[PDB]
Each structure stands twice: as structure tokens, then as C-alpha cells.
């Protein structure tokens, strides 16, 4: 099977600047009439993939001039000469030359901005939740940049790892920031045995700390 390896995996760029995405095949994708059926697709998170480039280097209907495709042999390149907000999303290469037709793994085109520290908010378990016998402590780390941030939980002054689940938003279309939710789930009994609950955001040193006492 033709393996399509896409680099980089993520590509921050300042709007108005150039972006380059590469796709390499594990074997030839030339067909017998001498043509190569390498396509590029753009997907946004609320969208289906849309065809942008076909046969290595051709813009599809309505694709503007800033998109260009090149390549030879086994290495292929999608270039965007002046990246616009509407261009951000996940790009995939694809070869339709040999069954099974295969896709590259995707490249997330993201926009740059100024660094921003997170706004951190901590919330205790609700009365409702304690009635089911569970206790989740929730920490939001909102509107930061860049996307890399670490959350650390402490219970009565000491690190807690177990029971933590994290989730991140896609990059915010309007302000180019990221947000993260971190949830520490305990039993009601384990929660009732301790007093101080703290969420700490680093990198970013030193941390942004939010706490409450049960």
C-alpha cells in the first residue's frame, strides 16, 4: 500500500505570510499515461473535506491563486503564498493512483499570535454530584497562547495525578487563543477526607494558582 507521510503535523503561521506542507509517498504514484493523481484536501472542524488541488499542481474550481501544488517522483508540496483566516484547518494529501487509495495523516494549519497567559478558574464538586457519591473538581484555563500548557493538581499541598482528565478546544477563530479544561474526579469519601484543592497552570516560571478549601 502507498504510505503517504505528511509533514509537519502542525504549522503555525502569521496571517499574510507563506506556508509550506509536504507529502511523500512510499512508492511511485505515476499511472500508465504518465500522470500522477495526487490531490490536496482542506478540512475545517465544522466541515467536510474540500478538494483544493488535483493531479499534483492544478487548482480546483474556485480555488484562489495563492494555493499552488508541486512535486516529482515521491515528494509533493502544497504552498499557500499569503495565508488567510479562511485557510486555517487541516490539510490532507491523497493518492488515487493505486488501489487502495490512501491519505496522508493531515497537517493542522494554525495562526500565530502574541503570547497570552490563561485565565484560570477552579470549581468544587456540586451538591448534586455529591448525592450520587462522586466528586469532580474542575479547572478551566481559558484563552491562552501558545497551546502548550501544563496543569498540576494538589490535594492538601501535595501533587495528585490519578483521576485527571484534560480536554482542549480547537484554536479560537476570533482571537487565536486556546482553552483547556482539567477535571479531577475523586470518590465523595476521598474528597471529604481532604481540605485544600489546587489547580496550577505552568509554561508559561512561576505558576498561576487557584485554590479552594472544602
Amino acid at each position: 500500500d502507498v504510505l503517504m507521510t505528511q509533514s509537519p503535523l502542525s504549522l503555525p503561521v502569521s496571517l499574510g505570510d507563506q506556508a509550506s506542507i509536504s507529502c511523500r509517498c512510499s512508492q511511485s504514484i505515476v499511472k500508465s499515461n504518465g500522470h500522477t493523481y495526487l490531490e490536496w484536501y482542506l478540512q475545517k472542524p465544522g466541515k467536510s473535506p474540500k478538494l483544493l488541488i488535483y493531479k499534483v499542481s492544478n487548482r480546483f474550481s474556485g480555488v484562489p491563486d495563492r494555493f499552488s501544488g508541486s512535486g516529482s517522483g515521491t515528494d509533493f508540496t502544497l504552498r499557500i503564498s499569503r495565508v488567510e483566516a479562511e485557510d486555517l484547518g487541516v490539510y490532507y494529501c491523497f493518492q488515487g493512483s493505486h488501489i487502495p487509495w490512501t491519505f496522508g495523516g493531515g497537517t493542522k494549519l494554525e495562526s500565530k499570535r502574541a503570547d497570552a497567559a490563561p485565565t484560570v478558574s477552579i470549581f468544587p464538586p456540586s451538591s448534586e454530584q455529591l448525592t450520587s457519591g462522586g466528586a469532580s473538581v474542575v479547572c478551566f484555563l481559558n484563552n491562552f497562547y501558545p497551546k502548550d500548557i501544563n496543569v498540576k493538581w494538589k490535594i492538601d499541598g501535595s501533587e495528585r495525578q490519578n483521576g485527571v482528565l484534560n480536554s482542549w478546544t480547537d484554536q479560537d477563530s476570533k482571537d487565536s487563543t486556546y482553552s483547556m479544561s482539567s477535571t479531577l474526579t475523586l470518590t465523595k469519601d476521598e474528597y471529604e477526607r481532604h481540605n485544600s484543592y489546587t489547580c496550577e497552570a505552568t509554561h508559561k516560571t512561576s505558576p498561576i494558582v487557584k485554590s479552594f478549601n472544602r
Binding site: 470549581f123 456540586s126 448534586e128 454530584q129 469532580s136 478551566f140
Partner: peptide, 25 residues
């Protein structure tokens, strides 16, 4: 789903914006 409210209490204390949530579990 169970739906749980996320409200502040004591903590701090207070500012111009307040953040609230819902935990959908």
C-alpha cells in the same frame, strides 16, 4: 448525562468578569 452546575463560592473575591460552567458527565 448528569449535569452539574459550576459556581465559584468564597475563593476570590470579586473581579469585573465571572466564569461559570456546567459539567456534563
Amino acid at each position: 448525562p448528569s449535569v452539574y452546575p459550576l459556581a465559584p463560592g468564597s475563593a476570590a473575591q470579586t473581579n469585573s468578569m465571572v466564569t461559570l460552567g456546567c459539567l456534563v458527565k
